[PDB]
Amino acid sequence: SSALLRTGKQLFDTSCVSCHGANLQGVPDHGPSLIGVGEAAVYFQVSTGRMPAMAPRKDPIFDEAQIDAIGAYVQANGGGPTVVRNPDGSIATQSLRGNDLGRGGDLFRLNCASCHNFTGKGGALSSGKYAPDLAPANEQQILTAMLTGPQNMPKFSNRQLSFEAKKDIIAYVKVATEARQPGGYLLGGFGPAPEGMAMWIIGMVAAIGLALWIGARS
Amino acid sequence: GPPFIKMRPEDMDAGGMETVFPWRESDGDGTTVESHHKLQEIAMGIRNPVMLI
Amino acid sequence: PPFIKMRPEDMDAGGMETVFPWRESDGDGTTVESHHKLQEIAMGIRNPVMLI
Ligand code: HEC
Numbered sequence A: 001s002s003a004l005l006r007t008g009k010q011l012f013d014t015s016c017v018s019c020h021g022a023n024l025q026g027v028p029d030h031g032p033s034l035i036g037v038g039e040a041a042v043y044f045q046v047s048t049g050r051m052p053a054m055a056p057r058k059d060p061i062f063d064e065a066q067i068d069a070i071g072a073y074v075q076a077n078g079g080g081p082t083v084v085r086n087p088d089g090s091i092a093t094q095s096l097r098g099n100d101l102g103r104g105g106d107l108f109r110l111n112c113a114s115c116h117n118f119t120g121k122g123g124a125l126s127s128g129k130y131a132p133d134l135a136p137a138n139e140q141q142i143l144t145a146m147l148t149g150p151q152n153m154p155k156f157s158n159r160q161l162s163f164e165a166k167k168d169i170i171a172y173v174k175v176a177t178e179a180r181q182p183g184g185y186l187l188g189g190f191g192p193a194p195e196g197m198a199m200w201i202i203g204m205v206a207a208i209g210l211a212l213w214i215g216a217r218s
Numbered sequence B: 001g002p003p004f005i006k007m008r009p010e011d012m013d014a015g016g017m018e019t020v021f022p023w024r025e026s027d028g029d030g031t032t033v034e035s036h037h038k039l040q041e042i043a044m045g046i047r048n049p050v051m052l053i
Numbered sequence C: 001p002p003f004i005k006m007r008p009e010d011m012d013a014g015g016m017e018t019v020f021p022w023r024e025s026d027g028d029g030t031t032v033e034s035h036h037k038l039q040e041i042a043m044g045i046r047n048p049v050m051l052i
């Protein structure tokens, strides 16, 4: 367990010691100290492919339950928020899903929609980094990422937001994106700029083609 | 529950972003018609919202 | 309260009144939902009844 965690984090020197130190001290030049964040931070930052880079999402590195070992190691090193687990030894998947939607939608439009999007797609920020799309997001990582406060994202405490609020938020997020749009083909969830592009590229072309077919050139 | 609840200094984080609105305790919670209408009026105000970081 | 209950003694041999269904489960006109329920009771074409 703890020894296996040390093996998979420090003895597996490919991952930890090259940026944060064997004792999780934190080299000031490259990364942070990494001493006050709990196992949830590690679980989110590892299971979503945001692995050490040269940082957009990529394939995960550790998947064979050793993420639990890394989380145990970091939580033993220092306290912090922990992963919400199903009452059977596994991670909660549908128990986290709530029932209320109006309150969840209002909270999304009050604090979530600002950066990400109205419909949860990608959002635009300033000077490089951006807002990723929520389509490849899974609910446990959604809750853990909110509770963790990753780069450029405001950290959220469980004290200021009720657990029912998280359940409603994740329920609304999963409903909005996974539901079929009852308006035909979707156009990226953006404003009317792609709509105008589509008008100029399809309506104009077909209209002028029909005009040339009907009319004559002389 | 009341549309707005009071705020404590401990209920924040080192990088927390929140939205607050004036309360005016004489307003009261959203139970009576007058209180509900006053709460809606304070909700619909352009220059009301304030960030606290 | 917009509506109050009725007693047999509170009439006269030549008096007329207008009454509406009460349905006490709605409650008095204090909360928003009870207020809307009472108003929609008041907003009904086939509701009013004359007792003479
Ligand atoms: C320098 C290469 C690099 C290595 C190696 C690396 N990371 Fe990171 N990661 C970073 C940097 C730099 C940050 C600081 C914030 C950022 O850049 O997003 C970070 C952020 C984090 C965060 C979220 C921010 C925080 O304060 O907690 C966690 C959790 C984390 N690292 C854990 C790990 C774990 C676990 C490993 C071993 C699998 C690891 N790091 C190895 C680059 C690296």
Ligand code: HEC
Pocket: A048, A050, A055, A056, A057, A111, A112, A114, A115, A116, A125, A129, A130, A131, A132, A133, A134, A136, A137, A141, A142, A145, A146, A150, A151, A152, A153, A154, A156, A169
């Ligand atoms: C612009 C400020 C900002 C706000 C406001 C914001 N986020 Fe984030 N969030 C970010 C950034 C930037 C990232 C991606 C950082 C990265 O990929 O390293 C992120 C990451 C995420 C992720 C992880 C996606 C993934 O694939 O890993 C989810 C889910 C998410 N945000 C949803 C939310 C929720 C829920 C809220 C409301 C609590 C929210 N966003 C509000 C900045 C913000």
